[PDB]
C-alpha cells in the first residue's frame, strides 16, 4: 500500500530536494510506496510552518521530513510533541527534550571541544551567530571555565590569531576577507570552521591567505557507499535534478537522502511487527486543545529512533531523544595540496589521529 | 463604549492578574472601558500559546495583552505580524524588530553594561539561566574584549538538573579555586535567594562578595544583608516608591484583600505586575479615541480560525498598532514612550545598593544618555 509522508522544504533548498527525490527512487520497495506531500515555505516564519504542519496533519501524514530554523524550531517541537507526529530533519540538533523529533545531523560540539584541546589552544576567539543554536556557545563557555581558557566570544550575527568561526557561510567570507585586508600576520592565523561541510563547495573557494584552516566532515568520499552514490549523482540531468551533477554533495543534502533511507527502514520494520501504517481515519482540527492521542504515533516514533543503517553520513543510529549516536566525524585540515583528513572523532574515543 | 481585548496569563502570574484587574478599574470611565477575555496558559508550550492567541484572534479583539517566554516568543511575533493583531506584553523585550508588538519592559542590557563599567569591574562571574535566555549574557560577552572583562559564565539554570554536579563543580572552581568575589546574577527575581544561598555554602570570605542582581525588580523580594552573608548587593529598579504616583498606588494596593486579589496587600509590587497595570493605562489611552465600531456580539473563539479566516487587513490593524505606539503617559514604571518598533524609550532605570538601613537609590541610568549618573 501507500504510506503518506510530508516534506517541509525551505524555498531554494534545491539540492536537498533533489537528494530527497533521488532517495525516494533508490530506497523504493515493492512492500509499500512512500507518497510525499511537499510544501515549500519560509522556515523562519512560525505561522507559515504552523500552516504547513497542519496541512500535512490533515492529509493524515504518518511522518514529516523537513527543516526548521532558530525561529521555528519551537513550533516544530511543540506541535510534534502535542500531535505525536514525527519530524525527521537535517537541521541543527538541539539538546532539550524533544520527543517526536529525529535529528539526522550529528552534534558537533564534542568534536569541536576535542579539536581545541588537540591543538592545545588556551586563548582564542569564538565568532558565532545563533543560526545553529547556542548550545555550542554554552559548551565552549563551560569548557573555558573548566580548563582555564581565555575565550573572546562575539556574536557576529547582528552586524550591520586562533579563531573559531561558527556562523553563516557569508559571514565567514566577510570575516576572513577582513583579516587579509588588515594585512597583519595573515598567514599566522588559524581558523577552525565549526560546521560539518568542510569540503562542501563554497568554503574552500575563500582566499585564506595561507592561514591554517581546520574543520569537520561527516560525508567521507572514501566510503564505498559515497563514491558509488557520487558516481551516479555526478551524472544526473541537472535540469531534472537541480543541484545535482556535482562531484560533491552538501552535507544537508546527504542527510536528506539518508533520511529517506531511515524513513523507509522504519516503515519496513513496523510492517514486520504488524503495526498498522496504512491510512489514518479521521483527523480532527489541527488546533484542537486538548489534542487527541494518536496511538500509532508513539510506535512510529519508536521505529524511526530504532533504525540502524549505514548511509552517506556514515553509521546512523539514534538514542531515545532522537539524537545521532555511534557516529564518526572526520577532522580535516587545508593542506598546501588541498583538504586532508588528519583524524576522526567518535563519542567513545574522542579525537584519534590518522 | 467598550473595546474587547484578550488577556493571556501564565500559571503563577497571580499578582500580575490582580494588577491587571485593578488597572481595569482604575482606568475605566463611565464613557469608555476595556472588556477583557482571559485565557490561562502554559507559556512555555508553543502549541498552547498558538491555540490561545488564535482563539483571541477568532473572537475579534482589538489587542491581546499577554506573556511569552524564550520558547514561545517566536510564535507571538510571527502570529501578531501575520494576523495584524497587536500584542502588548511585560515579557523580556526582543533583541530585533517585530511589528505589532508593544514591549512594556525597558531593556536592561544597556544599564547592566554601564553598571559593570561604573564599578570598574574587570573580572567577574556571570550566573545565568539558559531557559530564561542568553541575550544579556551575549551583550556582556560582546563588550568584554573592548572593555577588558574576564567573564566566567556559569549556567545556574542547571543547578537542580542533570548538569547539577557540573554546575556545582563550576561554581566551586570559580569561587574556591579562582577566588571570584564579583558575581552577576541574571535570573528570575524570586530565585535570587536560592542561588545566593548555594553560592554562600560553596564560596569563602563571602562577606566580601559584591553581587549585581541583573533584574529590573531589585526590591521585589526581601533584601536582608544577613541573607547575603554581609556582602555588597547592587541592582536595578524601574518602580520608584518615592514617586507620588507609585506611593498613591501602594496606599490603595496595600489594603486589598489577599484572597480576593492574590499578591496584593503588600508594600511593594513586582515590576512585571507594575508593567501589567501600566499596560492597561496604555491600552486605555490608545483606544479611547478609536472609532466606535458597530456594537457586535462577542463569541467564544475557535483556534482553527487562524487557518480558516484571513488576516486582519493590514491597513486596519496598523491603526491600532500606531495608536498604542503613540501613547505618552506616566505610570508605575515611570515615563512611558515607545519608538516605532514598540520598544520603551526615554525611560529611566534607578540604580540601587543594599545599605545599612535597607535598599537605597544611589543613581540612575537614562535611556537617552546611557550612563550611570550618581545621586547625592
Ligand atoms: C557503530 O560504529 C562503528 C564505526 O565506528 C561500526 O563499527 C565498525 O564497522 C565497520 C563496518 O562498517 C568496520 O570496518 C571493517 O573492519 C574490517 C576488519 O576490522 C575490515 O576488514 C573491513 O573491510 C571494514 O573496514 C569497523 O572495523 C568497525 N569499527 C569498530 C570500532 O568496531 C558499527 O558497525 C556501528 N554500528 C551501528 C549499529 O551503527
Ligand atoms: C602560522 C600559523 O598559521 N599558525 C597557527 C597556530 O596558531 C596553530 O595552532 C598551528 C597548528 O597547526 O598552525 C596554525
Ligand atoms: C525623548 O525621545 C526623543 C527621541 O525620540 C528625544 O528627542 C528626546 O530627547 C527625548 N526626551 C527626553 C526628555 O529624554
Amino acid at each position: 500500500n501507500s504510506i503518506q509522508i510530508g516534506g517541509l522544504f525551505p524555498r531554494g533548498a534545491d539540492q536537498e530536494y533533489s537528494a530527497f527525490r533521488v532517495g525516494m527512487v533508490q530506497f523504493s520497495t515493492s512492500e509499500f510506496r512512500l507518497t510525499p506531500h511537499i510544501d515549500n515555505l519560509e522556515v523562519a516564519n512560525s505561522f507559515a510552518v504552523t500552516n504547513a504542519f497542519c496541512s500535512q496533519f490533515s492529509r493524515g501524514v504518518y511522518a514529516i521530513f523537513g527543516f526548521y530554523d532558530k525561529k521555528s524550531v519551537n513550533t516544530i517541537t511543540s506541535f510534534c510533541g502535542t500531535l505525536h507526529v514525527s519530524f525527521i530533519t537535517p537541521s541543527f540538533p538541539t539538546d532539550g527534550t524533544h520527543p517526536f523529533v529525529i535529528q539526522m545531523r550529528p552534534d558537533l560540539k564534542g568534536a569541536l571541544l576535542s579539536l581545541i584541546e588537540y591543538y592545545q589552544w588556551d586563548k582564542f576567539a569564538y565568532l558565532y551567530d545563533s543560526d545553529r543554536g547556542l548550545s555550542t556557545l554554552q559548551a565552549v563557555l563551560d569548557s573555558a571555565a573548566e580548563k582555564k581558557w581565555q575565550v573572546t566570544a562575539i556574536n557576529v550575527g547582528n552586524i550591520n590569531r586562533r579563531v573559531i568561526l561558527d556562523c553563516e557561510r557569508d559571514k565567514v567570507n566577510d570575516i576572513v576577507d577582513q583579516v587579509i585586508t588588515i594585512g597583519k600576520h595573515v598567514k599566522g592565523y588559524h581558523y577552525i570552521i565549526a560546521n560539518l561541510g568542510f569540503t562542501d563547495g563554497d568554503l574552500l573557494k575563500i582566499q585564506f591567505g595561507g592561514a591554517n584552516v581546520s574543520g569537520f566532515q561527516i560525508v567521507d568520499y572514501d566510503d564505498s557507499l559515497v563514491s558509488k552514490f557520487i558516481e551516479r549523482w555526478s551524472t544526473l540531468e541537472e535540469k531534472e535534478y537541480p543541484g545535482a551533477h556535482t562531484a560533491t554533495i552538501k552535507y544537508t543534502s546527504a542527510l536528506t537522502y539518508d533520511a529517506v533511507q531511515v524513513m523507509t527502514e522504519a516503515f519496513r520494520n513496523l510492517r514486520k511487527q504488524r503495526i498498522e501504517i496504512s491510512r489514518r481515519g479521521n483527523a480532527g482540527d489541527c488546533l484542537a486543545n486538548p489534542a487527541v492521542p494518536w496511538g500509532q504515533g508513539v510506535e512510529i516514533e519508536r521505529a524511526l529512533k530504532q533504525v540502524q543503517v549505514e548511509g552517506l553520513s556514515g553509521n546512523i543510529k539514534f538514542d531515545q531523544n532522537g539524537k545521532r549516536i555511534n557516529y564518526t566525524i572526520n577532522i580535516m585540515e587545508l593542506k598546501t595540496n588541498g583538504p586532508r583528513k588528519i583524524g576522526y572523532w567518535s563519542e567513545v574515543d574522542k579525537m584519534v589521529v590518522t
Side-chain angles (χ1 to χ4, degrees), chain A residues 1-281 283-354:
Chain A
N1 54 16
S2 82
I3 301 170
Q4 318 295 320
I5 65 171
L8 262 57
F9 284 82
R11 305 197 169 278
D14 292 349
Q15 193 189 70
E16 285 88 349
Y17 184 53
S18 293
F20 180 84
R21 291 172 50 204
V22 166
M24 287 295 181
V25 179
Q26 175 77 5
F27 301 109
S28 62
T29 47
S30 57
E31 316 173 36
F32 52 83
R33 169 170 33 87
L34 292 184
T35 298
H37 306 265
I38 313 298
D39 287 319
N40 293 317
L41 67 170
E42 177 49 63
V43 298
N45 185 321
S46 296
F47 183 91
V49 168
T50 302
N51 178 70
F53 201 104
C54 286
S55 184
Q56 301 281 356
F57 171 84
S58 291
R59 290 185 189 93
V61 288
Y62 280 88
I64 295 170
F65 171 81
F67 296 76
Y68 48 65
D69 77 350
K70 65 173 176 287
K71 295 187 189 304
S72 59
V73 61
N74 289 114
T75 290
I76 291 300
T77 63
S78 187
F79 272 69
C80 289
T82 299
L83 302 168
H84 298 189
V85 169
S86 292
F87 190 88
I88 309 87
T89 187
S91 299
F92 70 90
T94 61
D95 284 345
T97 285
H98 46 80
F100 294 95
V101 181
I102 298 68
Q103 275 158 6
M104 296 294 302
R105 191 191 300 192
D107 188 29
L108 178 52
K109 293 187 304 290
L112 175 64
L113 294 172
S114 289
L115 189 56
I116 295 162
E117 291 154 27
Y118 166 84
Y119 286 137
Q120 303 180 25
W121 286 13
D122 60 10
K123 181 185 179 58
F124 61 91
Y126 174 71
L127 306 186
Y128 70 97
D129 59 39
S130 56
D131 294 16
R132 300 173 184 133
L134 289 179
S135 56
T136 299
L137 171 68
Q138 294 175 76
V140 167
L141 295 174
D142 289 346
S143 286
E146 178 79 8
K147 299 183 163 46
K148 295 177 294 301
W149 291 349
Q150 289 188 336
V151 178
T152 291
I154 300 178
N155 180 3
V156 299
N158 296 329
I159 293 181
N160 180 272
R161 9 219 143 100
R162 292 165 165 176
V163 177
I164 304 184
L165 304 174
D166 186 357
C167 51
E168 287 290 2
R169 316 190 200 102
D170 285 342
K171 300 193 145 291
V172 179
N173 217 320
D174 288 7
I175 289 169
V176 169
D177 285 15
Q178 177 69 27
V179 172
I180 304 188
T181 295
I182 293 176
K184 297 184 179 62
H185 290 90
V186 179
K187 267 182 289 295
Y189 276 77
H190 185 168
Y191 304 98
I192 293 173
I193 309 298
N195 69 41
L196 295 170
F198 198 60
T199 62
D200 288 6
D202 301 329
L203 175 70
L204 297 182
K205 290 179 179 180
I206 291 162
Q207 178 54 262
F208 291 96
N212 282 16
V213 191
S214 304
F216 307 89
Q217 180 93 0
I218 191 74
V219 174
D220 188 331
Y221 293 90
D222 289 338
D223 278 13
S224 159
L225 268 189
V226 179
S227 58
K228 282 179 166 57
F229 170 93
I230 285 301
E231 288 179 11
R232 277 183 270 185
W233 178 264
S234 66
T235 70
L236 289 178
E237 178 178 12
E238 205 180 345
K239 281 281 200 64
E240 186 179 7
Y241 294 100
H245 203 269
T246 53
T248 64
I249 180 173
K250 292 194 285 185
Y251 74 91
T252 46
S253 305
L255 290 177
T256 293
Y257 177 86
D258 285 353
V260 179
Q261 189 183 12
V262 169
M263 293 186 292
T264 300
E265 200 72 9
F267 288 113
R268 297 178 55 181
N269 292 337
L270 290 160
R271 187 175 190 93
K272 288 175 161 49
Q273 300 167 271
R274 299 197 169 188
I275 294 171
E276 186 159 300
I277 63 189
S278 59
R279 201 73 165 272
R280 294 187 65 173
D285 195 280
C286 178
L287 303 174
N289 207 331
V292 67
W294 178 37
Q296 308 309 99
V298 175
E299 298 289 4
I300 291 167
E301 164 191 34
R302 178 167 287 117
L304 288 161
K305 292 177 176 182
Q306 175 183 54
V307 165
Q308 299 169 13
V309 297
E310 190 172 342
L312 302 174
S313 62
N315 300 122
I316 298 162
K317 189 187 182 186
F318 302 100
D319 68 18
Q320 57 167 0
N321 301 320
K323 306 274 282 175
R324 292 276 300 264
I325 57 175
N326 196 65
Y327 58 86
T328 290
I329 293 174
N330 288 340
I331 310 305
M332 318 290 296
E333 292 181 349
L334 181 60
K335 308 290 206 171
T336 58
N337 239 338
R340 295 181 62 205
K341 179 178 67 176
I342 64 156
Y344 64 92
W345 183 94
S346 73
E347 309 176 288
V348 49
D349 322 335
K350 296 332 168 197
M351 178 162 175
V352 177
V353 54
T354 306

